[PDB]
């Protein structure tokens, strides 16, 4: 019980540089040392202690590492919007060899999404745009000689 409270109050908050256990100890020590005969302001003393705490920021041996979630899925999702410009060959500034898009035979998928949203069934309206762009990505691929996408 009380052990849980003590373990909670000593959690080291990084951005503040200290837990509340140290801050409470410092506030109590400052109140004890300078014996106050008059009224004290808890907020004022707290701000003063916060301003007065020593913080010897020293050079850490390791370079910091980023804590960031993986972004492969979202990057792949983004990669369907817009046209990917043809990469350049570093050896000769002329562009790399390329293939023209394919001639698949798909329906009016944006109109289909509009109809589905009108009826109140199917997927959403934004996912309709995503599906249309992904189907264009599939159909255009010269590697996959596709005569029809649906």
């Amino acid at each position: 019980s009380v052990a849980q409270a003590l373990a909670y109050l000593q959690v080291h908050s990084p951005q503040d540089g200290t837990s509340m256990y140290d801050h409470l100890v410092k506030l109590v020590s400052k109140v004890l040392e300078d014996q106050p005969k008059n009224a004290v302001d808890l907020l004022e003393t707290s701000l003063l202690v916060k301003k007065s705490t020593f913080d010897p920021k020293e050079s850490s041996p390791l370079v910091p590492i980023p804590v960031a979630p993986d972004a492969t899925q979202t990057q792949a999702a983004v990669s369907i919007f817009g046209d990917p410009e043809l990469p350049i060959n570093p050896a000769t500034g002329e562009p790399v060899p390329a293939d023209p898009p394919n001639e698949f035979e798909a329906e009016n998928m944006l109109g289909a999404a509009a109809v589905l949203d009108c009826l109140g069934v199917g997927l959403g309206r934004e996912l309709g745009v995503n599906i249309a762009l992904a189907a264009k990505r599939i159909g255009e691929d010269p590697k996959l000689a596709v005569r029809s996408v649906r």
Binding site: S59, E94, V96, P97, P100
Partner: protein
């Protein structure tokens, strides 16, 4: 009178952030025996963010100790290891980029990866001249005097011209480099440009969008 100097090699990330390096030193105490006695001493050197190249850290009291004379201080001279992207100059950073011609003229974005874990995408503001540079303020190494200010990253633009051009490509380039101003064009010029653009951005038979192979 004599001091032993030693290069201390760091990466740009360490100097940018501020490392706390540990270094080993071979100190030779000399005695009556023919062989000297050697020992490994550990030294902690604190390099603060943005210390300039050529900085000397001198440890007094350490060094090969002859029987009579107290050893002279040892010197560590800061030098940065070569980086794959940036070379530091004064307080800021130089990034040399090879740029195609059309990226210069039309204008695109250069994607650079900073020493800090951020990814800058800097647009080409205007027609980049041969030997021109693009400056991004507040992106170089930190100032050693104040730990908040930064230098300005300098991108030295190197242009990569195409190796081949056909006669029709040259005709298109010539027509693009002598087009009359829009308040001087005929109606035939406007219709021709409209037709050519609609035939260049054609979704199936046009070559504006091609998939690599």
């Amino acid at each position: 009178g004599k001091n032993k100097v030693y290069p201390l090699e760091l990466t740009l990330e360490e100097i940018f952030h501020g490392c706390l390096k540990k270094v080993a030193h071979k100190r030779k105490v000399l005695l009556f025996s023919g062989e000297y006695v050697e020992e490994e001493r550990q030294l902690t050197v604190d390099v603060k963010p943005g210390l300039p190249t050529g900085t000397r850290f001198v440890f007094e009291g350490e060094g090969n100790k002859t029987p009579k004379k107290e050893p002279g201080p040892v010197v560590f001279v800061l030098k940065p290891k070569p980086h794959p992207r940036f070379v530091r100059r004064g307080s800021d950073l130089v990034h040399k980029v090879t740029l195609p011609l059309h990226h210069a003229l039309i204008g695109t974005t250069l994607d650079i990866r900073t020493l800090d874990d951020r990814d800058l995408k800097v647009p080409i503001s205007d027609i980049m001249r041969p030997g021109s540079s693009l400056t991004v303020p507040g992106e170089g190494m930190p100032l050693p005097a104040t730990p908040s200010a930064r230098g300005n990253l300098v991108i030295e633009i190197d242009l990569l011209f195409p190796t081949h051009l056909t006669e029709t490509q040259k005709m298109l380039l010539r027509s693009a480099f002598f087009l009359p101003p829009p308040t001087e064009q005929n109606e035939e010029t406007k219709k021709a440009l409209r037709d050519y653009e609609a035939a260049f951005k054609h979704d199936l038979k046009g070559w504006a969008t091609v998939f690599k192979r």
